[PDB]
PDB file of N, CA and C in Angstrom:
ATOM      1  N   UNK H   1     103.682  98.148  72.948  1.00 42.62           N
ATOM      2  CA  UNK H   1     103.399  99.835  71.830  1.00 42.62           C
ATOM      3  C   UNK H   1     103.163 100.319  73.405  1.00 42.62           C
ATOM      4  N   UNK H   2     102.742 101.480  72.654  1.00 44.09           N
ATOM      5  CA  UNK H   2     102.230 102.940  73.897  1.00 44.09           C
ATOM      6  C   UNK H   2     100.498 102.987  73.977  1.00 44.09           C
ATOM      7  N   UNK H   3     100.208 102.415  74.774  1.00 45.92           N
ATOM      8  CA  UNK H   3      98.484 102.602  74.828  1.00 45.92           C
ATOM      9  C   UNK H   3      97.881 103.762  75.604  1.00 45.92           C
ATOM     10  N   UNK H   4      97.702 103.141  77.083  1.00 47.93           N
ATOM     11  CA  UNK H   4      97.553 103.766  78.117  1.00 47.93           C
ATOM     12  C   UNK H   4      95.717 103.970  77.890  1.00 47.93           C
ATOM     13  N   UNK H   5      95.071 103.046  77.446  1.00 48.71           N
ATOM     14  CA  UNK H   5      93.575 102.734  77.053  1.00 48.71           C
ATOM     15  C   UNK H   5      92.782 102.695  78.413  1.00 48.71           C
ATOM     16  N   UNK H   6      91.824 103.380  78.871  1.00 49.96           N
ATOM     17  CA  UNK H   6      90.672 103.733  79.423  1.00 49.96           C
ATOM     18  C   UNK H   6      91.446 104.076  80.292  1.00 49.96           C
ATOM     19  N   UNK H   7      91.427 105.149  81.379  1.00 50.05           N
ATOM     20  CA  UNK H   7      91.191 105.995  82.617  1.00 50.05           C
ATOM     21  C   UNK H   7      91.236 105.513  83.744  1.00 50.05           C
ATOM     22  N   UNK H   8      90.239 103.611  83.532  1.00 50.66           N
ATOM     23  CA  UNK H   8      89.781 103.378  84.567  1.00 50.66           C
ATOM     24  C   UNK H   8      89.339 101.615  84.240  1.00 50.66           C
ATOM     25  N   UNK H   9      89.152 101.113  85.197  1.00 52.31           N
ATOM     26  CA  UNK H   9      88.004  99.800  85.129  1.00 52.31           C
ATOM     27  C   UNK H   9      87.589  99.299  86.574  1.00 52.31           C
ATOM     28  N   UNK H  10      85.973  99.103  86.889  1.00 49.35           N
ATOM     29  CA  UNK H  10      85.717  99.581  88.169  1.00 49.35           C
ATOM     30  C   UNK H  10      86.190  98.222  88.640  1.00 49.35           C
ATOM     31  N   UNK H  11      87.124  98.652  89.896  1.00 50.46           N
ATOM     32  CA  UNK H  11      87.817  97.366  90.968  1.00 50.46           C
ATOM     33  C   UNK H  11      86.938  96.355  91.284  1.00 50.46           C
ATOM     34  N   UNK H  12      87.195  95.015  91.576  1.00 48.24           N
ATOM     35  CA  UNK H  12      86.921  94.445  92.007  1.00 48.24           C
ATOM     36  C   UNK H  12      86.398  94.304  93.517  1.00 48.24           C
ATOM     37  N   UNK H  13      86.819  95.558  94.020  1.00 45.93           N
ATOM     38  CA  UNK H  13      86.520  96.500  95.434  1.00 45.93           C
ATOM     39  C   UNK H  13      85.236  96.834  95.759  1.00 45.93           C
ATOM     40  N   UNK H  14      85.183  97.988  94.594  1.00 44.83           N
ATOM     41  CA  UNK H  14      83.702  98.731  95.333  1.00 44.83           C
ATOM     42  C   UNK H  14      82.090  97.688  94.514  1.00 44.83           C
ATOM     43  N   UNK H  15      82.721  97.033  94.011  1.00 48.91           N
ATOM     44  CA  UNK H  15      81.633  96.121  93.403  1.00 48.91           C
ATOM     45  C   UNK H  15      80.797  95.004  94.512  1.00 48.91           C
ATOM     46  N   UNK H  16      82.546  94.312  95.573  1.00 50.22           N
ATOM     47  CA  UNK H  16      82.305  93.681  96.670  1.00 50.22           C
ATOM     48  C   UNK H  16      81.533  94.591  97.799  1.00 50.22           C
ATOM     49  N   UNK H  17      81.925  95.688  98.001  1.00 50.80           N
ATOM     50  CA  UNK H  17      81.250  96.841  98.972  1.00 50.80           C
ATOM     51  C   UNK H  17      79.159  96.689  98.563  1.00 50.80           C
ATOM     52  N   UNK H  18      79.428  96.912  96.751  1.00 51.41           N
ATOM     53  CA  UNK H  18      77.592  96.279  96.429  1.00 51.41           C
ATOM     54  C   UNK H  18      77.375  94.712  96.577  1.00 51.41           C
ATOM     55  N   UNK H  19      78.652  94.060  96.466  1.00 49.38           N
ATOM     56  CA  UNK H  19      78.477  92.580  96.564  1.00 49.38           C
ATOM     57  C   UNK H  19      78.039  92.333  98.059  1.00 49.38           C
ATOM     58  N   UNK H  20      78.498  92.843  99.099  1.00 52.18           N
ATOM     59  CA  UNK H  20      78.235  92.665 100.581  1.00 52.18           C
ATOM     60  C   UNK H  20      76.758  93.306 100.746  1.00 52.18           C
ATOM     61  N   UNK H  21      76.084  93.838 100.112  1.00 51.51           N
ATOM     62  CA  UNK H  21      74.744  94.375 100.460  1.00 51.51           C
ATOM     63  C   UNK H  21      73.973  92.761  99.998  1.00 51.51           C
ATOM     64  N   UNK H  22      73.981  92.350  98.995  1.00 53.84           N
ATOM     65  CA  UNK H  22      73.216  91.229  99.110  1.00 53.84           C
ATOM     66  C   UNK H  22      73.345  90.191  99.622  1.00 53.84           C
ATOM     67  N   UNK H  23      74.680  89.973 100.093  1.00 57.04           N
ATOM     68  CA  UNK H  23      75.226  88.753 100.994  1.00 57.04           C
ATOM     69  C   UNK H  23      74.232  89.324 102.077  1.00 57.04           C
ATOM     70  N   UNK H  24      74.202  90.295 103.194  1.00 58.87           N
ATOM     71  CA  UNK H  24      73.112  90.343 104.022  1.00 58.87           C
ATOM     72  C   UNK H  24      71.859  90.485 103.663  1.00 58.87           C
ATOM     73  N   UNK H  25      71.582  89.776 102.383  1.00 57.78           N
ATOM     74  CA  UNK H  25      70.417  89.788 102.011  1.00 57.78           C
ATOM     75  C   UNK H  25      69.968  87.839 102.173  1.00 57.78           C
ATOM     76  N   UNK H  26      70.922  87.294 101.810  1.00 56.73           N
ATOM     77  CA  UNK H  26      71.261  85.891 102.085  1.00 56.73           C
ATOM     78  C   UNK H  26      70.990  85.454 103.649  1.00 56.73           C
ATOM     79  N   UNK H  27      71.827  86.517 104.032  1.00 55.92           N
ATOM     80  CA  UNK H  27      72.506  85.748 105.272  1.00 55.92           C
ATOM     81  C   UNK H  27      71.520  85.725 106.169  1.00 55.92           C
ATOM     82  N   UNK H  28      70.414  86.898 106.302  1.00 55.59           N
ATOM     83  CA  UNK H  28      69.120  87.800 107.515  1.00 55.59           C
ATOM     84  C   UNK H  28      68.326  86.816 107.390  1.00 55.59           C
ATOM     85  N   UNK H  29      67.673  86.807 105.891  1.00 56.92           N
ATOM     86  CA  UNK H  29      65.968  86.833 106.225  1.00 56.92           C
ATOM     87  C   UNK H  29      65.836  85.251 106.456  1.00 56.92           C
ATOM     88  N   UNK H  30      67.064  83.818 106.083  1.00 59.35           N
ATOM     89  CA  UNK H  30      66.525  83.274 106.640  1.00 59.35           C
ATOM     90  C   UNK H  30      66.487  82.631 107.940  1.00 59.35           C
ATOM     91  N   UNK H  31      67.463  83.179 108.374  1.00 59.13           N
ATOM     92  CA  UNK H  31      67.738  83.218 110.204  1.00 59.13           C
ATOM     93  C   UNK H  31      66.406  83.247 110.468  1.00 59.13           C
ATOM     94  N   UNK H  32      66.097  84.580 110.104  1.00 58.62           N
ATOM     95  CA  UNK H  32      64.846  85.364 110.201  1.00 58.62           C
ATOM     96  C   UNK H  32      63.481  83.988 110.222  1.00 58.62           C
ATOM     97  N   UNK H  33      63.528  83.780 108.858  1.00 59.29           N
ATOM     98  CA  UNK H  33      62.142  83.326 108.644  1.00 59.29           C
ATOM     99  C   UNK H  33      62.157  81.848 108.747  1.00 59.29           C
ATOM    100  N   UNK H  34      63.261  81.341 109.533  1.00 60.18           N
ATOM    101  CA  UNK H  34      63.142  79.841 110.062  1.00 60.18           C
ATOM    102  C   UNK H  34      63.107  79.902 111.293  1.00 60.18           C
ATOM    103  N   UNK H  35      63.834  80.619 112.229  1.00 60.84           N
ATOM    104  CA  UNK H  35      63.660  80.697 114.059  1.00 60.84           C
ATOM    105  C   UNK H  35      62.712  81.105 114.506  1.00 60.84           C
ATOM    106  N   UNK H  36      62.038  82.095 113.953  1.00 59.44           N
ATOM    107  CA  UNK H  36      60.530  83.406 114.264  1.00 59.44           C
ATOM    108  C   UNK H  36      60.058  82.154 113.569  1.00 59.44           C
ATOM    109  N   UNK H  37      60.120  81.606 112.679  1.00 61.99           N
ATOM    110  CA  UNK H  37      59.093  80.728 112.061  1.00 61.99           C
ATOM    111  C   UNK H  37      58.090  79.453 113.136  1.00 61.99           C
ATOM    112  N   UNK H  38      59.032  79.200 114.123  1.00 61.80           N
ATOM    113  CA  UNK H  38      58.394  78.247 115.018  1.00 61.80           C
ATOM    114  C   UNK H  38      57.333  79.174 116.300  1.00 61.80           C
ATOM    115  N   UNK H  39      57.274  80.628 115.928  1.00 61.54           N
ATOM    116  CA  UNK H  39      56.782  81.390 117.073  1.00 61.54           C
ATOM    117  C   UNK H  39      55.590  81.720 116.459  1.00 61.54           C
ATOM    118  N   UNK H  40      55.357  82.271 115.829  1.00 65.58           N
ATOM    119  CA  UNK H  40      53.967  82.696 115.126  1.00 65.58           C
ATOM    120  C   UNK H  40      53.096  81.736 114.575  1.00 65.58           C
ATOM    121  N   UNK H  41      53.493  80.481 114.517  1.00 69.80           N
ATOM    122  CA  UNK H  41      52.823  79.134 113.441  1.00 69.80           C
ATOM    123  C   UNK H  41      52.154  78.633 115.115  1.00 69.80           C
ATOM    124  N   UNK H  42      53.061  77.840 116.365  1.00 68.46           N
ATOM    125  CA  UNK H  42      52.173  77.065 117.054  1.00 68.46           C
ATOM    126  C   UNK H  42      51.312  78.221 117.353  1.00 68.46           C
ATOM    127  N   UNK H  43      51.733  79.358 118.502  1.00 66.75           N
ATOM    128  CA  UNK H  43      51.167  80.131 118.633  1.00 66.75           C
ATOM    129  C   UNK H  43      51.751  81.514 119.521  1.00 66.75           C
TER     130      UNK H  43
ATOM    131  N   UNK G   1     109.473 129.633  36.352  1.00 67.35           N
ATOM    132  CA  UNK G   1     108.527 128.471  37.444  1.00 67.35           C
ATOM    133  C   UNK G   1     109.565 128.377  39.163  1.00 67.35           C
ATOM    134  N   UNK G   2     108.734 127.283  39.982  1.00 64.81           N
ATOM    135  CA  UNK G   2     109.230 127.214  41.185  1.00 64.81           C
ATOM    136  C   UNK G   2     110.538 126.608  40.745  1.00 64.81           C
ATOM    137  N   UNK G   3     111.673 127.694  40.987  1.00 67.40           N
ATOM    138  CA  UNK G   3     113.274 126.666  40.530  1.00 67.40           C
ATOM    139  C   UNK G   3     113.777 126.829  42.396  1.00 67.40           C
ATOM    140  N   UNK G   4     114.041 126.171  42.865  1.00 64.82           N
ATOM    141  CA  UNK G   4     114.228 126.524  44.390  1.00 64.82           C
ATOM    142  C   UNK G   4     115.704 126.657  44.472  1.00 64.82           C
ATOM    143  N   UNK G   5     116.545 127.298  44.712  1.00 66.12           N
ATOM    144  CA  UNK G   5     118.103 128.110  44.136  1.00 66.12           C
ATOM    145  C   UNK G   5     118.749 127.013  44.836  1.00 66.12           C
ATOM    146  N   UNK G   6     120.379 126.681  44.958  1.00 69.42           N
ATOM    147  CA  UNK G   6     120.639 125.317  45.731  1.00 69.42           C
ATOM    148  C   UNK G   6     122.386 125.427  45.663  1.00 69.42           C
ATOM    149  N   UNK G   7     123.357 124.775  46.018  1.00 71.32           N
ATOM    150  CA  UNK G   7     124.836 124.952  45.479  1.00 71.32           C
ATOM    151  C   UNK G   7     124.957 123.828  44.647  1.00 71.32           C
ATOM    152  N   UNK G   8     124.084 122.816  45.155  1.00 72.99           N
ATOM    153  CA  UNK G   8     124.412 121.525  43.485  1.00 72.99           C
ATOM    154  C   UNK G   8     124.057 121.958  42.318  1.00 72.99           C
ATOM    155  N   UNK G   9     123.580 123.173  42.228  1.00 70.29           N
ATOM    156  CA  UNK G   9     122.912 123.376  41.036  1.00 70.29           C
ATOM    157  C   UNK G   9     123.659 124.869  40.214  1.00 70.29           C
ATOM    158  N   UNK G  10     124.317 125.458  41.173  1.00 73.69           N
ATOM    159  CA  UNK G  10     124.426 126.964  40.599  1.00 73.69           C
ATOM    160  C   UNK G  10     125.889 126.942  39.856  1.00 73.69           C
ATOM    161  N   UNK G  11     126.344 125.811  40.658  1.00 72.85           N
ATOM    162  CA  UNK G  11     127.819 125.386  39.250  1.00 72.85           C
ATOM    163  C   UNK G  11     127.454 125.464  38.605  1.00 72.85           C
ATOM    164  N   UNK G  12     126.558 124.039  37.306  1.00 73.57           N
ATOM    165  CA  UNK G  12     126.417 124.633  36.284  1.00 73.57           C
ATOM    166  C   UNK G  12     125.540 125.157  35.404  1.00 73.57           C
ATOM    167  N   UNK G  13     124.898 126.191  35.964  1.00 70.44           N
ATOM    168  CA  UNK G  13     124.344 127.177  35.852  1.00 70.44           C
ATOM    169  C   UNK G  13     124.267 128.392  36.505  1.00 70.44           C
ATOM    170  N   UNK G  14     124.118 129.812  36.126  1.00 75.11           N
ATOM    171  CA  UNK G  14     123.848 130.573  37.021  1.00 75.11           C
ATOM    172  C   UNK G  14     122.223 130.699  38.054  1.00 75.11           C
ATOM    173  N   UNK G  15     122.147 131.729  38.636  1.00 75.52           N
ATOM    174  CA  UNK G  15     120.889 131.808  38.970  1.00 75.52           C
ATOM    175  C   UNK G  15     120.426 133.634  39.567  1.00 75.52           C
ATOM    176  N   UNK G  16     119.732 133.882  39.433  1.00 75.06           N
ATOM    177  CA  UNK G  16     118.809 135.242  39.818  1.00 75.06           C
ATOM    178  C   UNK G  16     119.045 135.413  40.992  1.00 75.06           C
ATOM    179  N   UNK G  17     118.250 136.490  42.257  1.00 75.13           N
ATOM    180  CA  UNK G  17     117.941 137.174  43.048  1.00 75.13           C
ATOM    181  C   UNK G  17     116.972 136.120  43.464  1.00 75.13           C
ATOM    182  N   UNK G  18     115.750 135.597  44.608  1.00 76.23           N
ATOM    183  CA  UNK G  18     115.338 135.250  44.611  1.00 76.23           C
ATOM    184  C   UNK G  18     113.798 136.687  44.935  1.00 76.23           C
ATOM    185  N   UNK G  19     112.194 135.663  44.964  1.00 78.39           N
ATOM    186  CA  UNK G  19     110.803 136.405  44.490  1.00 78.39           C
ATOM    187  C   UNK G  19     110.179 136.247  45.545  1.00 78.39           C
ATOM    188  N   UNK G  20     110.614 135.166  46.380  1.00 77.30           N
ATOM    189  CA  UNK G  20     109.484 134.726  47.566  1.00 77.30           C
ATOM    190  C   UNK G  20     110.201 134.037  49.070  1.00 77.30           C
ATOM    191  N   UNK G  21     109.811 133.629  49.666  1.00 74.31           N
ATOM    192  CA  UNK G  21     110.170 133.480  50.883  1.00 74.31           C
ATOM    193  C   UNK G  21     109.312 132.118  51.067  1.00 74.31           C
ATOM    194  N   UNK G  22     110.863 130.874  51.133  1.00 70.79           N
ATOM    195  CA  UNK G  22     109.666 129.473  51.208  1.00 70.79           C
ATOM    196  C   UNK G  22     110.776 128.507  52.113  1.00 70.79           C
ATOM    197  N   UNK G  23     109.749 127.724  52.935  1.00 71.78           N
ATOM    198  CA  UNK G  23     110.421 127.024  54.137  1.00 71.78           C
ATOM    199  C   UNK G  23     109.848 125.311  53.257  1.00 71.78           C
ATOM    200  N   UNK G  24     110.690 124.356  54.111  1.00 72.61           N
ATOM    201  CA  UNK G  24     109.756 123.199  53.578  1.00 72.61           C
ATOM    202  C   UNK G  24     108.926 122.826  55.103  1.00 72.61           C
ATOM    203  N   UNK G  25     108.022 121.792  55.050  1.00 74.08           N
ATOM    204  CA  UNK G  25     107.425 121.540  56.281  1.00 74.08           C
ATOM    205  C   UNK G  25     106.833 119.753  55.780  1.00 74.08           C
ATOM    206  N   UNK G  26     105.758 119.693  56.041  1.00 77.09           N
ATOM    207  CA  UNK G  26     105.419 118.256  56.702  1.00 77.09           C
ATOM    208  C   UNK G  26     104.089 118.487  56.216  1.00 77.09           C
ATOM    209  N   UNK G  27     103.672 117.723  55.599  1.00 78.53           N
ATOM    210  CA  UNK G  27     101.842 117.692  55.353  1.00 78.53           C
ATOM    211  C   UNK G  27     101.337 116.171  55.605  1.00 78.53           C
ATOM    212  N   UNK G  28      99.938 116.243  56.296  1.00 81.03           N
ATOM    213  CA  UNK G  28      99.712 115.027  56.986  1.00 81.03           C
ATOM    214  C   UNK G  28      98.185 114.899  56.729  1.00 81.03           C
ATOM    215  N   UNK G  29      97.287 114.048  56.840  1.00 80.22           N
ATOM    216  CA  UNK G  29      96.017 113.674  56.526  1.00 80.22           C
ATOM    217  C   UNK G  29      95.270 114.501  57.403  1.00 80.22           C
ATOM    218  N   UNK G  30      94.271 114.418  57.190  1.00 78.26           N
ATOM    219  CA  UNK G  30      92.842 115.790  57.842  1.00 78.26           C
ATOM    220  C   UNK G  30      93.247 115.184  58.937  1.00 78.26           C
ATOM    221  N   UNK G  31      91.935 116.396  59.799  1.00 77.00           N
ATOM    222  CA  UNK G  31      92.207 116.400  61.206  1.00 77.00           C
ATOM    223  C   UNK G  31      91.207 115.955  61.404  1.00 77.00           C
ATOM    224  N   UNK G  32      91.042 114.536  62.583  1.00 77.81           N
ATOM    225  CA  UNK G  32      89.545 114.317  62.772  1.00 77.81           C
ATOM    226  C   UNK G  32      89.822 113.406  64.220  1.00 77.81           C
ATOM    227  N   UNK G  33      87.932 113.500  64.288  1.00 78.01           N
ATOM    228  CA  UNK G  33      87.970 113.509  66.144  1.00 78.01           C
ATOM    229  C   UNK G  33      87.135 112.308  65.888  1.00 78.01           C
ATOM    230  N   UNK G  34      87.048 110.915  66.436  1.00 75.03           N
ATOM    231  CA  UNK G  34      86.343 110.142  66.321  1.00 75.03           C
ATOM    232  C   UNK G  34      87.205 109.158  68.285  1.00 75.03           C
ATOM    233  N   UNK G  35      85.944 108.440  68.653  1.00 74.50           N
ATOM    234  CA  UNK G  35      86.238 108.243  69.744  1.00 74.50           C
ATOM    235  C   UNK G  35      86.178 106.200  69.720  1.00 74.50           C
ATOM    236  N   UNK G  36      87.121 105.927  70.625  1.00 73.54           N
ATOM    237  CA  UNK G  36      87.625 104.540  70.555  1.00 73.54           C
ATOM    238  C   UNK G  36      87.296 103.648  71.664  1.00 73.54           C
ATOM    239  N   UNK G  37      86.145 103.204  71.356  1.00 74.85           N
ATOM    240  CA  UNK G  37      85.200 102.298  72.673  1.00 74.85           C
ATOM    241  C   UNK G  37      85.424 101.080  71.650  1.00 74.85           C
ATOM    242  N   UNK G  38      85.870  99.838  71.958  1.00 73.75           N
ATOM    243  CA  UNK G  38      86.359  99.031  71.309  1.00 73.75           C
ATOM    244  C   UNK G  38      84.750  97.662  71.342  1.00 73.75           C
ATOM    245  N   UNK G  39      84.329  97.385  72.326  1.00 76.58           N
ATOM    246  CA  UNK G  39      83.039  96.946  72.693  1.00 76.58           C
ATOM    247  C   UNK G  39      83.072  97.320  74.050  1.00 76.58           C
ATOM    248  N   UNK G  40      80.986  97.192  74.215  1.00 77.67           N
ATOM    249  CA  UNK G  40      80.393  98.376  74.925  1.00 77.67           C
ATOM    250  C   UNK G  40      80.592  97.529  76.481  1.00 77.67           C
ATOM    251  N   UNK G  41      81.493  96.078  76.557  1.00 78.38           N
ATOM    252  CA  UNK G  41      81.761  95.730  77.898  1.00 78.38           C
ATOM    253  C   UNK G  41      83.198  96.278  78.456  1.00 78.38           C
ATOM    254  N   UNK G  42      83.341  97.441  78.039  1.00 76.87           N
ATOM    255  CA  UNK G  42      84.396  97.925  78.344  1.00 76.87           C
ATOM    256  C   UNK G  42      84.488  98.848  79.601  1.00 76.87           C
ATOM    257  N   UNK G  43      83.065  98.917  80.377  1.00 76.94           N
ATOM    258  CA  UNK G  43      83.736  99.442  81.407  1.00 76.94           C
ATOM    259  C   UNK G  43      83.573  98.515  82.908  1.00 76.94           C
ATOM    260  N   UNK G  44      83.632  97.336  82.183  1.00 73.86           N
ATOM    261  CA  UNK G  44      83.783  96.570  83.188  1.00 73.86           C
ATOM    262  C   UNK G  44      85.524  95.607  82.911  1.00 73.86           C
ATOM    263  N   UNK G  45      86.272  95.347  83.588  1.00 74.83           N
ATOM    264  CA  UNK G  45      87.088  94.215  83.357  1.00 74.83           C
ATOM    265  C   UNK G  45      86.075  93.114  83.758  1.00 74.83           C
ATOM    266  N   UNK G  46      86.843  91.560  82.322  1.00 74.57           N
ATOM    267  CA  UNK G  46      85.591  90.851  82.729  1.00 74.57           C
ATOM    268  C   UNK G  46      85.760  89.417  84.292  1.00 74.57           C
ATOM    269  N   UNK G  47      86.673  90.520  85.034  1.00 76.52           N
ATOM    270  CA  UNK G  47      87.126  89.954  86.296  1.00 76.52           C
ATOM    271  C   UNK G  47      85.146  90.442  87.370  1.00 76.52           C
ATOM    272  N   UNK G  48      84.887  91.103  86.847  1.00 75.24           N
ATOM    273  CA  UNK G  48      83.682  91.508  87.696  1.00 75.24           C
ATOM    274  C   UNK G  48      81.988  91.340  87.400  1.00 75.24           C
ATOM    275  N   UNK G  49      82.233  91.142  85.709  1.00 72.77           N
ATOM    276  CA  UNK G  49      81.695  90.645  84.545  1.00 72.77           C
ATOM    277  C   UNK G  49      80.663  89.327  85.013  1.00 72.77           C
TER     278      UNK G  49
END
């Protein structure tokens, strides 16, 4: 049949660019919250 | 009345001169403006969902 319905569907590319933002949240904080924890805690 | 002149019938009966200018045309149902979103989940392919 002939349809050509919807001149888009948001790619799984730009959302990855959005997915990359939260990923940096998952990777960054732990390393700080773990490593720097040794410093501010003892002295 | 509305009698369309023709060659298939001018044989078995005569015909006078016409008094109109008619053509043949196609008539179709009304013109309507309606949108086509099937489901609201349309803007996103299920790959991202």
